[PDB]
Symmetry: C2
Subunit: 315 residues, 2 copies
């Protein structure tokens, strides 16, 4: 039972680093790419496991790879921890692991170490995955929210809330997830000097990222409600539940802060890549502290982080 499941992982993720108790990585290689090591981890508990536009496996690579890539580092090595409910169909596990392998393979990421734990029926819901990941940040890239000052422009790299809306629609039964590895989109920005901060916008959406930006740099942020790009179908969920696309989780979207003079250059670079096409300016960094949303007639109102807890297991 165990080394049958264990056999699938070795087979699927086969690489020189997997072939004892840990992986062993060339450190000189890393230092030659950059002075800092980006290191991130995420758990994935998405219900259901498969959905329009992806699955838990692809998601598990994407999310962690993105958390690394957003620093400017190219993700290189990934760890992978599985928790399985006993009696999970092999067909399901196989398709999950396959998607993980091919997603990592396409992104040039090696899954270098791992673990598998099996619990009894009812102790876990089907399958949970943890991944941790790393890359070297190049010495000359200095992306961080602490660097933001009044005048900086906020951009978003595509429509807001596709993923959350897609999972909400499936589970409440009323749309395609954007789930993607963002490293190719991000490297387009690598050469552009006016880029100042980059975040992906998962749990808590761009609302959370924007409040995090404001607290990191000690400046206010003002956002134009009508400038928010939202697909009609996502707008549909918004109309029906009153929820805010600013709060929905995204699995392939960036929030980017740039020097004012560089907004056009950055947008045009975003628009020239497939991931990509729906990028938009949405707001700016201002002197007056706090996060505000501009509505009808240019009225600026405090944007609060949501009261209520989101539907569980959207990621």
């Amino acid at each position: 039972m165990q080394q049958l499941i264990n056999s699938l992982f070795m087979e699927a993720f086969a690489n020189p680093w997997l072939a004892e108790d840990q992986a062993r990585l060339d450190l000189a290689q890393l230092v030659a790419e950059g002075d800092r090591l980006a290191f991130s981890t995420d758990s994935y508990v998405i219900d259901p496991l498969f959905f329009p536009g992806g699955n838990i496996g692809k998601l598990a690579i994407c999310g962690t790879a993105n958390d690394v890539a957003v620093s400017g580092a190219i993700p290189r090595y990934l760890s992978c921890g599985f928790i399985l409910e006993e009696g999970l169909p092999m067909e399901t596990l196989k398709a999950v692991v396959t998607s993980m392998a091919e997603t990592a393979r396409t992104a040039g990421i090696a899954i270098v170490t791992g673990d598998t734990k099996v619990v009894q029926r009812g102790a876990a819901d089907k399958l949970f995955i943890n991944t941790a990941g790393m890359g070297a940040i190049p010495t000359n890239i200095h992306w961080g929210a602490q660097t933001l000052t009044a005048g900086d422009i906020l951009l978003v790299s595509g429509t807001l809330g596709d993923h959350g809306a897609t999972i909400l629609n499936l589970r409440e039964q009323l749309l395609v997830s954007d789930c993607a590895v963002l490293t190719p989109l991000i490297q387009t920005l690598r050469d552009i000097p006016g880029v100042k901060a980059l975040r992906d916008a998962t749990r808590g959406g761009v609302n959370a990222v924007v409040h995090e930006f404001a607290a990191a740099c000690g400046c206010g942020i003002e956002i134009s409600e009508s400038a928010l790009p939202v697909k009609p179908a996502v707008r549909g969920v918004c109309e029906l539940l009153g929820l805010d696309a600013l709060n929905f989780a995204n699995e392939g979207k960036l929030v980017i802060a740039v020097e004012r003079n560089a907004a056009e250059q950055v947008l045009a670079a975003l628009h020239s890549h497939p991931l990509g096409k729906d990028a938009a300016l949405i707001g700016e960094v201002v002197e007056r502290k706090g996060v505000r949303l501009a509505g009808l007639y240019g009225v600026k109102r405090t944007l609060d982080l949501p009261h209520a807890e989101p539907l569980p297991r959207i990621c």
Copy 2:
């Protein structure tokens, strides 16, 4: 409010200069390279039932296991990542006790928890709490420990008694005072062998106990390994379990034991280095690396028999 409260607990409990961050931790690479030429990188998920046991808990466990997986290479564990999976309506006092234990263990071991994640699921979707940790350290250039290197004549040591953790958990789940888990960070024990040239291979013996390690050792080198049954150090309370269940202390998970492979002429030197440390004290010679392939256990009258790989879920 609850996700902010949970996150509030992690940020305060683990607070350190690397967590203070956006989507990732940022680690000085020059400092790692000055320490070693290779980065040891490991991960483990922890799903133990129950959460609290004589000698530790899921929280302490999550630091020790991953730290040891790193330290077993020769590296000093430096940085840990940490993902929690919480069942909705898990009592705060329980979470708080677990997180407190983790933080204290990481702190005692000189380890920073530099990044993390937290996911909550509905009632029924998880059993209380699962933790994944991942960890790294730099492996000093002059330490080349691995089983691939083993050859006939090499001596097999174990650093202490066998089966403490496994038996402790079995007893609780199956209701059979004397049993305590060996749960510990082994870094200070490992650094004791750091300079000893005769050390060739080193592993912890968690899932599948030492039986598994010895088999992996045998597979890695192209040789057989022979274990002496009477040489095996087993606490009386563990023998008590073996006697009742008929299960093998060689198969029981350990959470604070090393299986060590040394050159014959280093055996006694390594025993003394082990014996001088608390962790430490019950180290014993248990076997040999031989030419004839296979894993064998020597029983009565020195009869060598093939030792097969064989378990209760959620022991780790």
